[PDB]
Structure 1
Amino acid sequence: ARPRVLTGDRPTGALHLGHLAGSLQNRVRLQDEAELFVLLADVQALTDHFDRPEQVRENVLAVALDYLAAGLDPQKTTCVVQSAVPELAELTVYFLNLVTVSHLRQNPTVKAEIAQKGYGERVPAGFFVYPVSQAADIAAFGATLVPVGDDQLPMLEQTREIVRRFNALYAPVLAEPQAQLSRVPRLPGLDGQAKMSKSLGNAIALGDSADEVARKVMGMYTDPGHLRASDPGRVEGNPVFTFLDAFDPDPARVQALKDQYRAGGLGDVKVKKHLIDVLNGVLAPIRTRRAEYERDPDAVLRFVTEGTARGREVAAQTLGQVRRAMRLFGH
Structure 2
Amino acid sequence: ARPRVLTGDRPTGALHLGHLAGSLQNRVRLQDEAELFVLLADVQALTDHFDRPEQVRENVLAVALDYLAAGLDPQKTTCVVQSAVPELAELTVYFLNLVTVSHLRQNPTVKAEIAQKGYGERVPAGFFVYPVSQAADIAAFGATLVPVGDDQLPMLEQTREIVRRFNALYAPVLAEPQAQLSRVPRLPGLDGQAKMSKSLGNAIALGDSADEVARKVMGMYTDPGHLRASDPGRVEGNPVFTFLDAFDPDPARVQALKDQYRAGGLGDVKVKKHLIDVLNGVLAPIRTRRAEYERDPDAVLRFVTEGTARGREVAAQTLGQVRRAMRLFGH
TM-score higher than 0.5: yes
Per the alignment, residue 119 of structure 2 pairs with 119
SS at match of 1:97: helix
1:293 and 2:293 correspond: yes
Partner Cα separation in structure 2 for residue 312 and residue 12 of structure 1: 22
Cα distance, 1:175 vs. partner? 0.1
Partner Cα separation in structure 2 for residue 145 and residue 19 of structure 1: 18
Cα distance, 1:275 vs. partner? 0.1
1:3-56 alpha-carbon deviations (Å, 9 max, x no partner): 000000000000000000000000000000000000000000000000000000
Partner Cα separation in structure 1 for residue 91 and residue 129 of structure 2: 13
Partner Cα separation in structure 1 for residue 211 and residue 109 of structure 2: 36
Cα distance, 1:208 vs. partner? 0.1
Cα distance, 1:145 vs. partner? 0.1
Partner Cα separation in structure 2 for residue 156 and residue 218 of structure 1: 37
SS at match of 2:146: strand
Partner Cα separation in structure 2 for residue 108 and residue 72 of structure 1: 31
Cα distance, 1:304 vs. partner? 0.1
1:103-152 alpha-carbon deviations (Å, 9 max, x no partner): 00000000000000000000000000000000000000000000000000
Cα distance, 1:319 vs. partner? 0.1
Partner Cα separation in structure 1 for residue 188 and residue 317 of structure 2: 40
Per the alignment, residue 8 of structure 2 pairs with 8
Partner Cα separation in structure 2 for residue 114 and residue 218 of structure 1: 33
Cα distance, 1:325 vs. partner? 0.2
Cα distance, 1:183 vs. partner? 0.1
Per the alignment, residue 213 of structure 1 pairs with 213
Partner Cα separation in structure 1 for residue 241 and residue 3 of structure 2: 35
Identity %: 100
Partner Cα separation in structure 2 for residue 305 and residue 115 of structure 1: 37
SS at match of 1:112: helix
Partner Cα separation in structure 2 for residue 153 and residue 65 of structure 1: 28
1:84-113 alpha-carbon deviations (Å, 9 max, x no partner): 000000000000000000000000000000
Partner Cα separation in structure 1 for residue 79 and residue 279 of structure 2: 27
Cα distance, 1:285 vs. partner? 0.1
Cα distance, 1:60 vs. partner? 0.1
Cα distance, 1:286 vs. partner? 0.1
Cα distance, 1:257 vs. partner? 0.1
Cα distance, 1:199 vs. partner? 0.2
Cα distance, 1:227 vs. partner? 0.3
Per the alignment, residue 167 of structure 2 pairs with 167
Report the RMSD for the aligned CA atoms in angstroms. 0.2
SS at match of 2:179: strand
Partner Cα separation in structure 2 for residue 103 and residue 6 of structure 1: 24
Q: Which TM-score applies when normalising by structure 1?
A: 1.00
Aligned length: 331
1:198-229 alpha-carbon deviations (Å, 9 max, x no partner): 00000000000000000000000000000000
Q: Which portions of structure 1, spanning 4 or more consecutive aligned residues, are displaced by more than 4 angstroms? A: none
Partner Cα separation in structure 2 for residue 21 and residue 216 of structure 1: 17
Partner Cα separation in structure 2 for residue 276 and residue 107 of structure 1: 38
Partner Cα separation in structure 2 for residue 74 and residue 134 of structure 1: 24
SS at match of 1:5: strand
SS at match of 1:155: helix
**1:1-331 paired onto structure 2 within 5 Å:** 1-331=1-331
Cα distance, 1:323 vs. partner? 0.1
SS at match of 2:37: strand
Partner Cα separation in structure 1 for residue 230 and residue 296 of structure 2: 51
1:233-276 alpha-carbon deviations (Å, 9 max, x no partner): 00000000000000000000000000000000000000000000
Partner Cα separation in structure 1 for residue 275 and residue 173 of structure 2: 49
Identify unmatched segments of 5+ residues in structure 1: none
Partner Cα separation in structure 1 for residue 25 and residue 5 of structure 2: 14
Partner Cα separation in structure 1 for residue 149 and residue 251 of structure 2: 23
Identify unmatched segments of 5+ residues in structure 2: none
SS at match of 2:80: strand
Cα distance, 1:61 vs. partner? 0.1
Partner Cα separation in structure 1 for residue 301 and residue 112 of structure 2: 36
Partner Cα separation in structure 1 for residue 120 and residue 98 of structure 2: 25
